[PDB]
Amino acid sequence: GETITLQVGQCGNQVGLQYWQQLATEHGIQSDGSSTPYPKDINDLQLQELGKYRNDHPELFFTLSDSNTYTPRSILIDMEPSVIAKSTSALPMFNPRNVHLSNNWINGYKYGTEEEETLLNLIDREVDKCDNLSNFQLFHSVAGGTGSGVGSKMLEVISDRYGHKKLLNTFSIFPSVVVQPYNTILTLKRLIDYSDATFVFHNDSLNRIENIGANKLIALVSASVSNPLRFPGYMYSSMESIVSNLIPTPDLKFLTSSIAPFSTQKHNYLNEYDMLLELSNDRYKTNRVSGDTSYISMLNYLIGDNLDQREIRKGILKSQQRISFVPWVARSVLVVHGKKSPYLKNTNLEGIQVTNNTSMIDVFTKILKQFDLLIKENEVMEMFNESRESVKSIIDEYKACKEI
Amino acid sequence: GETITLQVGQCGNQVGLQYWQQLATEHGIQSDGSSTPRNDHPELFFTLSDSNTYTPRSILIDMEPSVIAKSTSALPMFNPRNVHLWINGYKYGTEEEETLLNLIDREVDKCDNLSNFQLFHSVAGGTGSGVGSKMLEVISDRYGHKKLLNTFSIFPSVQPYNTILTLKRLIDYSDATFVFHNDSLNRIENGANKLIALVSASVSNPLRFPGYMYSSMESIVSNLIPTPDLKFLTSSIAPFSTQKHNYLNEYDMLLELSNDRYKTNRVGDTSYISMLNYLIGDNLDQREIRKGILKSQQRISFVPWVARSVLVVHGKKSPYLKNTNLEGIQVTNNTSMIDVFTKILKQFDLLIKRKAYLNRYYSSVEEENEVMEMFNESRESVKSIIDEYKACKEITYLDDD
Amino acid sequence: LDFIFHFNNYIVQVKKVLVLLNHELFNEYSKEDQESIDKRFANLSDTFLMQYEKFGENLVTFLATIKQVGERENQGLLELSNRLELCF
Amino acid sequence: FNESSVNISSTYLRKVLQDAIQISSVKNFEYVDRLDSRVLNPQHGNLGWESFTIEYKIDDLPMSYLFEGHQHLQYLKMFHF
Amino acid sequence: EPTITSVDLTIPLPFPLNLVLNQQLSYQYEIMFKLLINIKFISKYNSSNWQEMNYSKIWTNSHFNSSVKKWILRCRVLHSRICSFIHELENYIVHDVIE
Amino acid sequence: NIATTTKSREEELNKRIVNYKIQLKLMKNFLQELIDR
Amino acid sequence: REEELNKRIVNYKIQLKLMKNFLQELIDRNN
């Protein structure tokens, strides 16, 4: 399958630029689109005295032209041209054709509605270059202005133009002003309605991790989620398969991610066993999680050369007891044995953990309380009421998740 | 067979200059007619002397000598012997009928086996449009219908009267008329004659650079004109070429050639009557073209009574153009002609109810009656073609009910 | 191929018949009755219908044959079958 | 694969294999030529899913004479599971 | 049968070129020559008949009655279908098989 | 049952027979030219 | 089913061999 990335808003563009530079670095694709010859495999031992061949899948994201030039499957949507200019200058490989240029959520939503035909033509143009499309990836901020309204309208348009036949992820960034709570609730309503799997990122928790920029961590997590897809292995290798393993019902679709920070410091993790235990720590999760949390699904990513199986097995066994699983979900912890890109010189391990826990009760409770405080033509107020009721519809559902 | 080009009016002469420059560049013929160091066949468009000089077969007609002088000076290999210098223009064409008839008969005698007449002219050209309208009549009368005519008429962006008077004869005598709008040409550019020249040069590519198939103009045209009434063609050109971000595959050329924004005439929903796509590259991958043909057939809305076939010609790029990337031209027959013809008729009716400028044409009682009957006939013919194109859309076209 | 060739020959022979139907050109060509004209048109009706239905029959049989052969042995004929089926 | 194992023909298998090679990351694989699909037992009661097997051709090398058929049969049993 | 069904082309070859272009190969080439000439000829018969059907004076005459007009329209559409079918068949045979 | 494979078995056999029908007929024509002299 | 094609193949192999032997016999006798 193929994945199409859409970036909306200033924050979305800032994240996407580093996300694409990360992917280009891993796959050895230079900023000008030229490809690098593939280094010989490390575990493919050979006898010893004493150019287009590849074994990865970079084209799952980049369109390989007839002239051996790669180009990302990205679409940049916003109104301020400064961020787009910076992004294009940093990465000339971006297709100029794919760029679209133009505070209140309603104004942005109406602008998206009026100019929906052009954006739709762009989406169809990108899809036409893809055979056997798999999913869409969205990088946008829930609150912030252009991103909220434009991303919500694009969400609805993509959801209903293709009959929901392809799943649609969402790398939403939550805000850390009088208009912000309204925007957050209004966008979260469409996130509930249309999105298939949402990665919640909280700026305050990102700042908590950082001080031990903020967009680099989001880029790293997003570019490490799809590691099995770009370097296929025994399991997964499909975006639908990864998501389906963490979403038991359509309602419990909000995922959160944990990141191991110490990928480079010379006091890095000793081995896989240590990192398996350290990943469960609550101080490195990207969403504030209390001690009353319970996990619905578990997924751990390991990225390194020739990982020791004994350490991984022992780490899984020890971590299974520590984690508090929801009563009606069987105790199951899964580890993804990803492959490190041969182009990267760094030999240290990296590991990203993706979880579906019940900590969303508190986060949406804070959002709901702020919205209720701020509330104290008429059509918009009806939409506000509908968003309030839709959010409560999963507040109570996540609460009921505790019960058999 | 050989082809004869007729250039009428200032716009026609400029477009013809660009067209002949393009053709000479493709065949490596220098400005003086000398060859440059065969598998191609420029003889279909150039006369070869026994002193190794190539001269165009075109005939230049214009009311003033400035345009012809510029055209001849720019391209010295034009033969000066072929240079000749609305109602007033048409009556003037009647006076010069003998000279023009002999002038065209000279070119016909000079070639070995004539195939078709090409005509470059502007419908909104005023007097030159009148002389071209007379040219069509005299040619069709003298040579019968064994030799077909192709007119690359440029449509308009007092003009309504001229457009209707020229369109009456364009409908009556032309055999396959291309439609070009300056509006869509300048929209694409966002000079303009370089698009028309490119389209016209590419339309005949299978003749000048022979391949396995489509070796004659009869085969090219017959695929697009099921009925002599529906004779107007819509041409589409892919502009994204020679840039770094070109179309990566011919398959994407086939898919993105159908965009309504690239068409050379103003278009909503349309039904295609016939299709033929040009692909011009040194090497063409067959399997990509098969996939693109299948997708194009499954995507495009054909009229019920047409065979629903999409034809892709595998043109060969000229040796004299160095290793340039793929380019392609699309020529279609749509039902979108009803919109532009309706626009022209609306303007004509609006300006015919108001006797704004008819004093320049109505000289007396007999002139009033003559112009009235002529205008009525033209209006009725245009309505007839609109009704025919509208009846093509429905499903009961072949029914006698 | 036989049917197409014979259809072209029939088209050529039709040109003679159409002279008699219309009057405006019959006088010009004769330089070198209602019942009879009705009979001529009635004859052309059945002849043309026969050719039309024969074309339909031949097309159906040809497509079926290509489809079976392409599915069995030849890969190249299968895509031709798909294209022709998408045509008619 | 939905239809019975007797209905599947060689041309359909070749089309499936080529399309799957183009879609996946094996199109850049060094020995993509050696890959070849087959159906083992075309019984009426066996569907496509119960018979399709992928076969890696090493007959072009002398190594194939070392690897007796029994080993290959045990390589096709484990693949089936 | 029309002569087109029975016109053949033969090319004797110099020694030793004829050893590689063996007579069995040239015979298989000759069969293709005959097939392609048949199809080319029919396409040339489909174009000339299309020229008359559209622009010959008798067919293009406007003074027919309604019934004859509809008959002519039906005949033109049927001939267009035959033309498209032949061009599709020739395209397959020549580009999808030979080239 | 015989194993099914991506390559068309019957196509190969049919092509062999056609190539064996060309050799036979060419040989017959040559022998006719040889005998009649 | 394909047994029948193989049978015809071998029959034509024999016929071709017979024709070639006929050529050799004729040439030997003429010499």
Tab-separated table of C-alpha atoms in Angstrom, chain A residues 66-390:
chain	number	residue	atom	x	y	z
A	66	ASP	CA	11.592	7.858	-14.273
A	67	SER	CA	14.834	9.834	-13.777
A	68	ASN	CA	15.743	8.163	-10.458
A	69	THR	CA	14.539	11.143	-8.409
A	70	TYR	CA	12.392	10.754	-5.304
A	71	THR	CA	9.607	13.117	-4.319
A	72	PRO	CA	7.466	12.963	-1.158
A	73	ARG	CA	3.745	12.223	-1.333
A	74	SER	CA	3.011	15.373	0.674
A	75	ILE	CA	0.410	18.126	0.360
A	76	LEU	CA	1.005	21.464	2.096
A	77	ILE	CA	-2.096	23.497	2.982
A	78	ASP	CA	-1.984	26.834	4.816
A	79	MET	CA	-2.333	30.591	4.273
A	80	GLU	CA	0.885	32.177	5.566
A	81	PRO	CA	3.600	31.667	2.901
A	82	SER	CA	6.653	32.203	5.145
A	83	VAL	CA	6.561	28.708	6.653
A	84	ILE	CA	6.029	27.128	3.233
A	85	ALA	CA	8.931	29.138	1.825
A	86	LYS	CA	11.181	27.926	4.641
A	87	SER	CA	10.043	24.321	4.164
A	88	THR	CA	10.600	24.382	0.402
A	89	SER	CA	14.002	26.049	0.761
A	90	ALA	CA	15.086	23.422	3.288
A	91	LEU	CA	13.798	20.596	1.042
A	92	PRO	CA	13.802	21.511	-2.669
A	93	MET	CA	12.528	17.986	-3.385
A	94	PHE	CA	9.002	19.107	-2.476
A	95	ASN	CA	6.833	19.431	-5.562
A	96	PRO	CA	5.821	23.092	-6.065
A	97	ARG	CA	2.523	21.900	-7.685
A	98	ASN	CA	1.570	20.279	-4.330
A	99	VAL	CA	1.645	23.575	-2.391
A	100	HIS	CA	-1.643	25.399	-1.802
A	101	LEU	CA	-1.651	28.971	-0.483
A	102	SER	CA	-4.571	31.222	0.405
A	103	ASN	CA	-8.140	32.934	13.904
A	104	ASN	CA	-11.837	32.105	14.061
A	105	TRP	CA	-12.582	28.447	13.401
A	106	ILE	CA	-15.800	29.295	11.552
A	107	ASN	CA	-13.982	31.579	9.109
A	108	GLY	CA	-11.428	28.905	8.229
A	109	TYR	CA	-14.138	26.260	7.886
A	110	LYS	CA	-16.143	28.484	5.534
A	111	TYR	CA	-13.005	29.278	3.527
A	112	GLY	CA	-12.339	25.560	3.171
A	113	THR	CA	-15.923	25.018	2.053
A	114	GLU	CA	-15.822	27.777	-0.571
A	115	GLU	CA	-12.488	26.638	-2.056
A	116	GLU	CA	-13.117	22.909	-1.616
A	117	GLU	CA	-12.968	22.126	-5.341
A	118	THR	CA	-9.310	23.144	-5.730
A	119	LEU	CA	-8.155	21.209	-2.673
A	120	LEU	CA	-10.171	18.206	-3.848
A	121	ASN	CA	-8.527	18.380	-7.266
A	122	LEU	CA	-5.139	18.356	-5.539
A	123	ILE	CA	-6.069	15.309	-3.439
A	124	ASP	CA	-7.267	13.481	-6.546
A	125	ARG	CA	-4.062	14.367	-8.394
A	126	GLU	CA	-1.963	12.910	-5.580
A	127	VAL	CA	-4.123	9.776	-5.402
A	128	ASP	CA	-3.862	9.199	-9.154
A	129	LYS	CA	-0.103	8.702	-8.739
A	130	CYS	CA	-0.785	5.985	-6.133
A	131	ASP	CA	-1.716	2.395	-6.975
A	132	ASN	CA	-3.495	0.430	-4.242
A	133	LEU	CA	-3.702	3.303	-1.776
A	134	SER	CA	-3.701	2.347	1.907
A	135	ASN	CA	-4.212	5.341	4.212
A	136	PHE	CA	-3.871	9.088	4.701
A	137	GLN	CA	-1.691	10.812	7.296
A	138	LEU	CA	-2.667	14.214	8.690
A	139	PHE	CA	-0.342	16.594	10.542
A	140	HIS	CA	-2.319	19.439	12.091
A	141	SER	CA	-2.894	21.281	15.356
A	142	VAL	CA	-6.261	20.955	17.073
A	143	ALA	CA	-6.146	24.622	18.115
A	144	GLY	CA	-4.261	27.487	16.513
A	145	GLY	CA	-6.465	28.877	13.757
A	146	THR	CA	-5.828	27.928	10.134
A	147	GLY	CA	-4.950	24.363	11.053
A	148	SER	CA	-8.153	23.667	12.968
A	149	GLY	CA	-10.695	24.801	10.392
A	150	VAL	CA	-8.800	23.777	7.280
A	151	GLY	CA	-7.880	20.362	8.665
A	152	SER	CA	-11.434	19.728	9.835
A	153	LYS	CA	-12.859	20.581	6.417
A	154	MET	CA	-10.232	18.442	4.676
A	155	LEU	CA	-11.057	15.628	7.108
A	156	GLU	CA	-14.723	15.720	6.145
A	157	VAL	CA	-13.961	16.076	2.435
A	158	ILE	CA	-11.561	13.127	2.340
A	159	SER	CA	-13.827	11.000	4.525
A	160	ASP	CA	-16.861	11.422	2.273
A	161	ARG	CA	-15.208	11.683	-1.164
A	162	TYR	CA	-13.742	8.149	-1.077
A	163	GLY	CA	-16.575	6.393	0.875
A	164	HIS	CA	-14.345	5.807	3.998
A	165	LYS	CA	-12.829	2.765	2.116
A	166	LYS	CA	-9.293	3.734	3.345
A	167	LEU	CA	-8.393	4.342	6.970
A	168	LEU	CA	-7.301	7.853	7.926
A	169	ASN	CA	-4.833	8.513	10.742
A	170	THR	CA	-4.344	11.832	12.535
A	171	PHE	CA	-1.178	13.145	14.205
A	172	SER	CA	-3.038	15.851	16.091
A	173	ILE	CA	-1.154	18.210	18.408
A	174	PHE	CA	-3.148	19.516	21.330
A	175	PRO	CA	-2.666	23.070	22.637
A	176	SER	CA	-0.727	23.671	25.837
A	177	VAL	CA	-6.644	32.786	24.452
A	178	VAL	CA	-10.440	33.032	24.601
A	179	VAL	CA	-10.887	31.337	21.215
A	180	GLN	CA	-8.641	28.306	21.785
A	181	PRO	CA	-11.070	26.081	23.779
A	182	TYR	CA	-13.799	26.620	21.190
A	183	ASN	CA	-11.414	25.563	18.427
A	184	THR	CA	-10.246	22.517	20.373
A	185	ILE	CA	-13.764	21.211	20.987
A	186	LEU	CA	-14.959	22.019	17.471
A	187	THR	CA	-12.060	20.147	15.875
A	188	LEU	CA	-12.309	17.234	18.309
A	189	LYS	CA	-15.922	16.753	17.207
A	190	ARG	CA	-14.802	15.984	13.647
A	191	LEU	CA	-11.890	13.933	14.984
A	192	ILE	CA	-14.466	11.718	16.689
A	193	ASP	CA	-16.694	11.579	13.621
A	194	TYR	CA	-14.171	10.924	10.835
A	195	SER	CA	-10.676	10.002	12.029
A	196	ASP	CA	-9.861	6.299	12.316
A	197	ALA	CA	-6.924	6.510	14.751
A	198	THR	CA	-5.685	9.634	16.536
A	199	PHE	CA	-2.221	10.116	18.044
A	200	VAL	CA	-2.738	12.615	20.867
A	201	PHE	CA	0.278	14.850	21.513
A	202	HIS	CA	0.188	17.387	24.351
A	203	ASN	CA	2.540	20.359	24.140
A	204	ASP	CA	2.926	20.678	27.916
A	205	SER	CA	4.042	17.057	28.277
A	206	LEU	CA	6.320	17.528	25.268
A	207	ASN	CA	7.943	20.458	27.074
A	208	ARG	CA	8.247	18.282	30.182
A	209	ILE	CA	10.166	15.682	28.174
A	210	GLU	CA	12.269	18.258	26.335
A	211	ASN	CA	13.742	20.010	29.372
A	212	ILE	CA	15.208	16.709	30.597
A	213	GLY	CA	12.681	21.434	19.867
A	214	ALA	CA	9.183	20.243	20.719
A	215	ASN	CA	8.457	19.483	17.055
A	216	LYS	CA	11.514	17.237	16.739
A	217	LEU	CA	10.049	14.751	19.225
A	218	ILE	CA	6.769	14.623	17.292
A	219	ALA	CA	8.682	14.086	14.061
A	220	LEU	CA	10.736	11.292	15.626
A	221	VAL	CA	7.669	9.494	16.975
A	222	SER	CA	5.751	9.822	13.703
A	223	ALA	CA	8.719	8.658	11.611
A	224	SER	CA	9.361	5.728	13.964
A	225	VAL	CA	5.753	4.501	13.990
A	226	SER	CA	6.026	3.465	10.333
A	227	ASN	CA	9.401	1.735	10.685
A	228	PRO	CA	8.010	-1.772	9.958
A	229	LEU	CA	6.374	-0.446	6.785
A	230	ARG	CA	9.567	1.034	5.326
A	231	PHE	CA	11.764	-1.892	6.474
A	232	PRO	CA	9.467	-4.914	6.182
A	233	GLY	CA	9.807	-7.742	8.679
A	234	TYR	CA	7.954	-10.863	9.787
A	235	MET	CA	4.978	-9.058	11.335
A	236	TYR	CA	2.801	-6.077	10.460
A	237	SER	CA	4.376	-4.246	7.487
A	238	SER	CA	0.917	-2.721	6.925
A	239	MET	CA	-0.512	0.408	8.518
A	240	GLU	CA	-3.954	-1.162	8.938
A	241	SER	CA	-2.415	-4.120	10.782
A	242	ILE	CA	-0.592	-1.916	13.298
A	243	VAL	CA	-3.639	0.227	14.071
A	244	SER	CA	-6.037	-2.726	14.219
A	245	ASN	CA	-3.948	-4.219	17.032
A	246	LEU	CA	-4.618	-1.275	19.382
A	247	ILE	CA	-8.217	-0.247	18.636
A	248	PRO	CA	-10.735	-2.756	20.045
A	249	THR	CA	-13.828	-0.718	19.163
A	250	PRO	CA	-14.372	2.336	16.951
A	251	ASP	CA	-14.946	4.526	20.012
A	252	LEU	CA	-11.685	3.657	21.817
A	253	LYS	CA	-9.636	5.037	18.934
A	254	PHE	CA	-7.464	7.646	20.692
A	255	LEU	CA	-3.870	6.431	21.018
A	256	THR	CA	-0.970	7.957	22.925
A	257	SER	CA	2.760	7.489	22.444
A	258	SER	CA	5.759	7.135	24.745
A	259	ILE	CA	9.286	8.056	23.647
A	260	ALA	CA	12.646	6.931	25.034
A	261	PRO	CA	14.688	10.172	25.024
A	262	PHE	CA	18.250	8.892	25.449
A	263	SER	CA	18.956	7.780	21.880
A	264	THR	CA	22.294	9.644	21.691
A	265	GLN	CA	23.735	10.448	25.150
A	266	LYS	CA	26.734	8.247	25.928
A	267	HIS	CA	24.892	6.905	29.012
A	268	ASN	CA	22.371	5.194	26.719
A	269	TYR	CA	20.453	2.061	27.660
A	270	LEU	CA	22.607	-0.973	28.379
A	271	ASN	CA	20.528	-3.478	26.399
A	272	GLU	CA	17.030	-4.304	25.184
A	273	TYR	CA	15.989	-5.629	28.600
A	274	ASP	CA	16.646	-2.268	30.261
A	275	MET	CA	14.828	-0.287	27.570
A	276	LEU	CA	11.777	-2.551	27.729
A	277	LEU	CA	11.409	-1.685	31.411
A	278	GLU	CA	12.211	2.000	30.946
A	279	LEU	CA	9.616	2.472	28.203
A	280	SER	CA	6.741	1.858	30.627
A	281	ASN	CA	7.821	4.848	32.737
A	282	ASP	CA	5.189	7.578	32.996
A	283	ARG	CA	7.713	10.443	32.949
A	284	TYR	CA	8.433	10.043	29.209
A	285	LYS	CA	4.879	9.643	27.902
A	286	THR	CA	3.686	12.413	25.595
A	287	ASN	CA	0.366	12.630	27.479
A	288	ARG	CA	0.022	13.291	31.202
A	289	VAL	CA	-0.984	9.965	32.773
A	290	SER	CA	-1.819	9.316	36.422
A	291	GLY	CA	-1.442	6.242	38.589
A	292	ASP	CA	-5.078	5.160	38.191
A	293	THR	CA	-4.554	4.498	34.470
A	294	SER	CA	-5.259	1.149	32.833
A	295	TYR	CA	-3.926	-0.045	29.480
A	296	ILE	CA	-6.189	-1.474	26.789
A	297	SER	CA	-3.397	-2.395	24.347
A	298	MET	CA	0.400	-2.509	24.312
A	299	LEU	CA	2.918	-2.100	21.493
A	300	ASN	CA	6.675	-1.603	21.840
A	301	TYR	CA	9.088	-0.698	19.043
A	302	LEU	CA	12.725	-1.803	19.067
A	303	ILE	CA	15.159	-0.500	16.447
A	304	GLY	CA	18.635	-2.015	16.343
A	305	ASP	CA	20.924	-4.498	14.691
A	306	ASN	CA	20.737	-8.185	15.766
A	307	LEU	CA	18.703	-7.709	18.926
A	308	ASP	CA	19.229	-10.317	21.637
A	309	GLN	CA	16.156	-12.544	21.824
A	310	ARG	CA	16.819	-13.636	25.416
A	311	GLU	CA	16.757	-10.052	26.683
A	312	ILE	CA	13.549	-9.241	24.804
A	313	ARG	CA	11.785	-12.358	26.086
A	314	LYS	CA	12.804	-11.684	29.692
A	315	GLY	CA	11.844	-8.022	29.393
A	316	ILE	CA	8.401	-8.851	28.033
A	317	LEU	CA	7.858	-11.337	30.856
A	318	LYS	CA	8.857	-8.817	33.529
A	319	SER	CA	6.904	-5.930	31.990
A	320	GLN	CA	3.715	-7.981	31.617
A	321	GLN	CA	3.244	-8.205	35.393
A	322	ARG	CA	3.931	-4.518	36.043
A	323	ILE	CA	1.362	-3.203	33.558
A	324	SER	CA	-2.215	-2.872	34.843
A	325	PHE	CA	-4.397	-4.269	32.063
A	326	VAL	CA	-8.108	-3.518	31.706
A	327	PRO	CA	-10.094	-6.414	33.246
A	328	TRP	CA	-11.778	-7.568	30.019
A	329	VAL	CA	-8.605	-7.438	27.874
A	330	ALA	CA	-6.209	-10.377	28.033
A	331	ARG	CA	-2.717	-9.566	29.299
A	332	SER	CA	-0.796	-9.069	26.044
A	333	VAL	CA	2.426	-7.139	25.403
A	334	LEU	CA	3.814	-7.028	21.860
A	335	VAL	CA	7.310	-5.977	20.771
A	336	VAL	CA	8.160	-4.907	17.211
A	337	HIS	CA	11.641	-6.005	16.104
A	338	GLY	CA	12.315	-3.152	13.723
A	339	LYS	CA	15.411	-2.885	11.547
A	340	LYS	CA	17.721	0.107	11.784
A	341	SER	CA	18.406	1.922	8.537
A	342	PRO	CA	21.847	0.919	7.185
A	343	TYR	CA	22.466	4.540	6.189
A	344	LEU	CA	22.478	5.668	9.827
A	345	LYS	CA	25.923	5.517	11.414
A	346	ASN	CA	24.533	5.642	14.959
A	347	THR	CA	24.487	2.094	16.326
A	348	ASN	CA	22.560	2.890	19.513
A	349	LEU	CA	19.053	1.516	19.874
A	350	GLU	CA	15.900	3.585	19.665
A	351	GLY	CA	12.522	2.553	20.992
A	352	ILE	CA	9.053	4.088	20.747
A	353	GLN	CA	6.043	2.777	22.669
A	354	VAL	CA	2.462	3.311	21.479
A	355	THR	CA	-0.346	2.730	23.974
A	356	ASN	CA	-4.142	2.879	24.199
A	357	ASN	CA	-4.800	3.626	27.877
A	358	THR	CA	-7.672	5.196	29.807
A	359	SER	CA	-5.818	8.425	30.661
A	360	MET	CA	-7.938	10.188	28.025
A	361	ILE	CA	-10.654	10.608	30.667
A	362	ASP	CA	-8.700	13.348	32.444
A	363	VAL	CA	-7.494	15.118	29.285
A	364	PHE	CA	-10.930	15.409	27.710
A	365	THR	CA	-12.290	16.332	31.142
A	366	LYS	CA	-9.928	19.319	31.260
A	367	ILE	CA	-10.918	20.312	27.728
A	368	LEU	CA	-14.611	19.975	28.579
A	369	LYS	CA	-14.296	22.008	31.781
A	370	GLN	CA	-12.484	24.841	30.000
A	371	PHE	CA	-15.108	24.824	27.241
A	372	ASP	CA	-17.942	24.928	29.781
A	373	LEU	CA	-16.328	27.854	31.589
A	374	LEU	CA	-15.829	29.792	28.354
A	375	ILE	CA	-19.373	29.228	27.082
A	376	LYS	CA	-20.849	31.006	30.118
A	377	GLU	CA	-26.317	32.988	13.643
A	378	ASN	CA	-27.667	30.541	16.218
A	379	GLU	CA	-26.448	27.639	14.062
A	380	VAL	CA	-22.968	27.784	15.592
A	381	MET	CA	-24.278	27.385	19.140
A	382	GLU	CA	-26.092	24.237	18.025
A	383	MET	CA	-22.775	22.939	16.687
A	384	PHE	CA	-21.186	23.770	20.051
A	385	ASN	CA	-23.897	21.769	21.828
A	386	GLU	CA	-23.372	18.880	19.408
A	387	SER	CA	-19.612	18.921	20.044
A	388	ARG	CA	-20.236	18.924	23.801
A	389	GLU	CA	-22.544	15.913	23.513
A	390	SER	CA	-20.203	14.046	21.158
